[PDB]
Amino acid sequence: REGWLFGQQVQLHYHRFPDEQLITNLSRWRTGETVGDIAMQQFRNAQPFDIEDKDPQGVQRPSPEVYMKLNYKNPATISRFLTRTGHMYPADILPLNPEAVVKLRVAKAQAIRIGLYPRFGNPFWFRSQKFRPKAYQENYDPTTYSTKRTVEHFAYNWVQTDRIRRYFRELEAVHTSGSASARGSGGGTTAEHKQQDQFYSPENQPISLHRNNISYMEDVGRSVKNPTVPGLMSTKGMKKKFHNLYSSTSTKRMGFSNPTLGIKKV
Amino acid sequence: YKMPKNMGVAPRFDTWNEKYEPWEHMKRMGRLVGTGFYIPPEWYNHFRMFPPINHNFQQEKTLNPHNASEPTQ
Amino acid sequence: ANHPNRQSGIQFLTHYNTHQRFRVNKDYIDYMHWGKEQGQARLPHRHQRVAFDFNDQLHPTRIGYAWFASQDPTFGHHPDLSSSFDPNYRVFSHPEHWNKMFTKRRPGEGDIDLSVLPSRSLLGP
Amino acid sequence: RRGKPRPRAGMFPDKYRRVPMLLKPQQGGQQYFNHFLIRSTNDRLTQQDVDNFISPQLPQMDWRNMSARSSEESIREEMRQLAENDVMQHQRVFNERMWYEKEEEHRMKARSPPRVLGGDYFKTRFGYSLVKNSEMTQGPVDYSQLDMWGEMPRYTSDMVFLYLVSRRRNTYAVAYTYEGKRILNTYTAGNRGLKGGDRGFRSEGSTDNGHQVTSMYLNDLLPKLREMRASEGRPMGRGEKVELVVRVMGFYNGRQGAVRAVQDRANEFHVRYFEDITPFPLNGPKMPRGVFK
Amino acid sequence: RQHDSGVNQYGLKPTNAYDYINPTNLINFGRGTTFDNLGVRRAGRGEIDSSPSHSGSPVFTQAKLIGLSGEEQLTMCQSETMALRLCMAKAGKETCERESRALDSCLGRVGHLRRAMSEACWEFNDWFIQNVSDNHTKPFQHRPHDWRHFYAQEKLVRERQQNGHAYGRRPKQFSFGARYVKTDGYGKRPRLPYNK
Amino acid sequence: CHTAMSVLNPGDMRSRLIYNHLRILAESVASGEMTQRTAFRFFESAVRSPAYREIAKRQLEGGAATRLAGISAAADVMRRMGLTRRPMSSYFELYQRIVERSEAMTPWGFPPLFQFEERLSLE
Amino acid sequence: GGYMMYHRKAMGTMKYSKWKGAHGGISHFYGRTPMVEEVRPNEPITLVDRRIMHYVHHSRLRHFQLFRSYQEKSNSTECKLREGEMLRRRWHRRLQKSFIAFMQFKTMKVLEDQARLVNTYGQAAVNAALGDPWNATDNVARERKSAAVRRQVRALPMVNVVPKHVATMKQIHNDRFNYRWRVN
Amino acid sequence: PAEHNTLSSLRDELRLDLTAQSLKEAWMRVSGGVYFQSVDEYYASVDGL
Amino acid sequence: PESLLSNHMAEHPDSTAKPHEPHTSSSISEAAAFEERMLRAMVSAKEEDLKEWLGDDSRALSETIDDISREEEEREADIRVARSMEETDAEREVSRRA
RNA sequence: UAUACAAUUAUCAUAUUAAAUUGUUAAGUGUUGAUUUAACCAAUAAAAAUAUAAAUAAUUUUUAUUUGUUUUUAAACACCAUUAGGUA
RNA sequence: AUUAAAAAGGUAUUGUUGCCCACCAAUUUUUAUAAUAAAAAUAACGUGCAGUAAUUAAUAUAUUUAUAAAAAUAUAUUUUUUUUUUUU
Ligand SMILES: [Mg+2]
Ligand SMILES: [Mg+2]
Ligand SMILES: [Mg+2]
Ligand SMILES: [Mg+2]
Ligand SMILES: [Mg+2]
Ligand SMILES: [Mg+2]
Ligand SMILES: [Mg+2]
Ligand SMILES: [Mg+2]
Ligand SMILES: [Mg+2]
Ligand SMILES: [Mg+2]
Ligand SMILES: [Mg+2]
Ligand SMILES: [Mg+2]
Ligand SMILES: [Mg+2]
Ligand SMILES: [Mg+2]
């Protein structure tokens, strides 16, 4: 048993039944947390995108008008279907209705022998860019074989969440510490807290917790770069050895040692 | 000659369902109890009078995706 | 049968002139691009099937609603009346129609007959 | 240890593993804590001396405003308002990009009865149904989008064509007059030394060799150019660049470096056109047979 | 009961007749094998025989998918690093740490971003194992001989065109310029094989 | 959990008929008299009501019923059968296991091989 | 002897060897030139070159040219290699779609998370966190913010990496861009 | 969701009714960024009220 | 015609020819034509924006590009080669007899 | 010594209802020389792109017809031998 | 203050110190006797190292070559190991 698209063993979905958001959240629902709740509304019935090629091999590409100009005398319209070198795209890259492929290879042939199209290169390459669907990294086409774009938008939205989190942690921080400028000796302090916590500790005001501190700072001026004269020992004339340097013991249990690591080049 | 690793334990993709299908157990248990020498389990005491649905057939036996096999699913 | 070109199997339930599907010289099948809707690429297409399942619909009767006037006024289009249904309909199969064998299989190459797919050109109209 | 390399430092258990955490580092100076606490507290009060929403709102006194909302004018308005906002929003949370586009369009727009044709009329016009769906611009069409030579090089009787050919084990450079006459000979990775009796073939066609060759060639190219021009009476005395067309062949490593050695000459040579001539084999005579086939 | 139905006391429970003649198959599938690890043929993760399979060929590129650690790998901040590089190269009289601040901000975020992507990808490995992978049980689709039947269908066609004769036959390759080097009366282009 | 969440439209699960089906099958999964797979295929293939789908067109659009009746019945059965020593545990576990799966991608579908007991299993 | 232009020995430099065709201005390469780029004023030709090369490499043209222009291979090995390439492609596509079908689910769970943040802090607040100018008194603040966004959106030229060509000993593949072994 | 202003900013005029949304935007304007997970956390911050 | 004048002049300088301009025709007034001018200049503005930013000064950019090309060169040189590339024919024959 | 193939799917040599066959294009000189190769040796180097429809299905072609061997190098590549040539 | 994980083949069968391949002697036995008949049994001696993705991957056809396995080239091909651009 295989799904057609990627061979999945299930039919893809997010939610199915009318109740599930309710039943999952039920204690929240009796409580009444869920009254203005926009998460249980927006995504409640939300299902996956259709990621499918409606044309696996495009019989749609090109639209009808274009066929008219797929003849030998339209260098431009030849060019919108080729690479920048003038070669055709492989079928599984840019799929074309077989009519278009026939007309196109014939066209380029004719055009070439008549001198109306160059034997290599695409002379209209820049002009044709309007006709190609140039896809902005900023929009998202739910159907792509691009794995980069998907993860890029995932990144984007997740970071848009992280921003919020950070904004509201620094805000409440600012209010806990700004309360001190609001109330100096107003309250919130226990006697036992006066006993235990008013002493210097790693949580309170440690000195430094790490090796290689900065001590002795001074205003002295920069020196000339490379004040040091090259040593008497020449490092240049020495050849670097890696593999045979020490002696090793092989953990190979059985069989001939792999010919690609050693015994091959290069 | 390299092959996919688990081909030794590879399931029969056509027939692995047969063993588990309700009708089979109905028949087998049916002629087991008939003997007189087997105490019928209670599920049999029940589905004895409510035998399962007739025309639900797997996709393995019928090779049609478009066949809606189950009244339920 | 493990022999290549014999993979299509023994099907009797086809409409062809041999019960051995792989001797049939009419419709050569396409294992890579076929069988989205029919399951396996061997089996007959939805419109050519001569055997029918219990819970699956059978063929639509072609027309080529006015005649339901006696019926339920709300009753819409009957599921089995279709405008366009062709029992003889050539499905595009690459090894037949686009045949790359005599070439090096570079992007434009292979011989193509256009008589299969209806022309999407504007030239006709 | 013995005839084997020393383990990296991290492969030994912690050097101070037996010293308690309160000892590394010691938090000493506790005596002062309290002192500074008092101090800081004191300072806060000092900083006040330098320096130095619960308005009761009765719900009965608002009544006039509430009565304004019972009028069918204001509810006609809330209806229009809510029916304009009821179309399905694709916005979701506030987006920076779309805001920017929006306001940039507002800056750009701030810088800025006849009988309806029936279905029967458009039944009779076959053309119109094809105009509505057409990709082709209707109106005067820009000519620069037609002519063959629009996007293409435009040369001049004074131009120098620099050929950088990267090969697998070699790289070389030449220069040519527009009229086809050769300027200097071909400086080659094997011509300059730089190749044999040495490090190896693997590095022979490398990037840095191509750089060495191109940068050695341009150096020798300038004076001879000024002489070939002095011969016809074109002085090019000062403040001039050579207008250059860089033609590059080969898709091999030695290409990269080559063009770099042109780019650092940008104060001498001015590149108008970068066009690569790389042969493509549709099919042709047999190439030499390799090992496997 | 206390464990799986496909695994009994001594190893994988031997259903087909292949298991009874060859019962090494029950207890050893490789060097990633443990005893709880029988019947689950995939072994743990980061472990030998942990790789999920897709139509029989194992999935060894996972990091390359989410664009962590690949040559095609997704880059978070470019505009920043370029901006800062430009600053460094232009002049030495003015030094801009403003650029280095925008950049180090960018990086500071990037860390958490990456841990997120990695986590989501491990969840993908789990999902892929549950709902997609066949656990190396189906025949490879990824090399041309696996598709032999397909090619056969094409050879058959070129045979029926030839009056059902030459199977697997192709036109004789001629010469680089066979057409213009040959005199009248000799074939100047390669014919159908049956036509010879 | 499977009988509750893995089945579109298992009829009205309050009705004594379908309820008894479920009860019996449950007591047969406990005490090992049946395979889980067999009892599941028994449940979904059990006899409900004539012209089932065409009565289903009078309630459901895409054939997905509401899941409350299913869970209330499935807890009821475990309570009336003596399944647990402490009464609450039945309901709690049946509830909890559903809530955890709610977050998973394609949560209520399952690959047919791994869904139940079979030769090869998941870790 | 006569060699093609993509041949190893093509343009030789020796005492006997002499290059063929008009070699400058309007030249031997006249209609044979695969790419042409007018250099934009104040643009180093290194960006131009790395753009061209990235293009050719990603679309597997430089692959093809390197491959065919070095050795002869029979039409069977060419077919085997090309269809193998294409079927490996097919497989990895069917992997990508699975990954993507999952990542859209992940992205959904994220957007959902964002919704929950919305009804914890209220919509407007969340919008504030996202850079909404509610603090913009006058247009000058707006133009500062949008000047910031302008200076972000402007794209610095991307320097896209081109994998080096690996020269091996007898050259089983001159398509070699990595040190991995290949099936010829 | 219906009747939910998606683009709302803090310099928007305060809505008239009492909803989790309207009250939370209001509270943002009044207290600044003070937000508490639950009511006993607020009673924690005020300490003895 | 103006697209070809450069190359015609460059090939045969002695040849005398004129740039040939079409006969002009004006729609509406010089006003609608000035508006066409605003439209073409605005399209050249959106395209001047989209095309390339290119920083400011050329040499400052070239320095950076060449730097990063160099750094990639020497992060490359640290990759393990294949055994076969590394070893001579000496040890090949040694392992052969072995 | 006699004493029961298959006929639903079986890889080495007894083919058989099939639409082909024919197309005259490309490419070539400036000058003083280390190209190719892991390595040797001979020694001008550039190149040869276009065709669908249509042909009806079966019943006496089995001595008939048919399955990559091909004039012309004064044209190359390629391959074989090694500077003399063979072949293409 | 310069780290490792996840994909892989066996003509062997406690498994490469594993097996095997031809020529090169004796003999045994059948015959349709081609440099020196053919074929089959076979446990010496002497060459090597052909094969088990096996030290330039193998397999089939074709043509050439030859101490012996075999080797070179021309086509098909995996009973060889995979590396993967849906218009940039
Ligand atoms: Mg093998
Ligand atoms: Mg194995
Ligand atoms: Mg393994
Ligand atoms: Mg000769
Ligand atoms: Mg026979
Ligand atoms: Mg005898
Ligand atoms: Mg004999
Ligand atoms: Mg050997
Ligand atoms: Mg061999
Ligand atoms: Mg070998
Ligand atoms: Mg052989
Ligand atoms: Mg020999
Ligand atoms: Mg042989
Ligand atoms: Mg061979």
Automatic annotation (TrEMBL), chain B:
Superkingdom of the organism of origin: Eukaryota
Native organism: Trypanosoma brucei brucei (strain 927/4 GUTat10.1)
Protein name in the entry: Uncharacterized protein
Automatic annotation (TrEMBL), chain C:
Domain of life per record: Eukaryota
The protein's name in its UniProt record: Enoyl-CoA hydratase/isomerase domain-containing protein
Full protein stretch here: 50 to 194 of 1211
TrEMBL record, chain F:
Species assigned in the record: Trypanosoma brucei brucei (strain 927/4 GUTat10.1)
Highest taxon, organism lineage: Eukaryota
Residues represented out of the complete protein: 124 to 246 of 307
Record's protein name: Uncharacterized protein
Gene Ontology, cellular component aspect: mitochondrial small ribosomal subunit
UniProtKB/TrEMBL annotation, chain G:
Superkingdom of source: Eukaryota
Organism: Trypanosoma brucei brucei (strain 927/4 GUTat10.1)
Gene field: Tb03.26J7.200
Full protein name: Uncharacterized protein
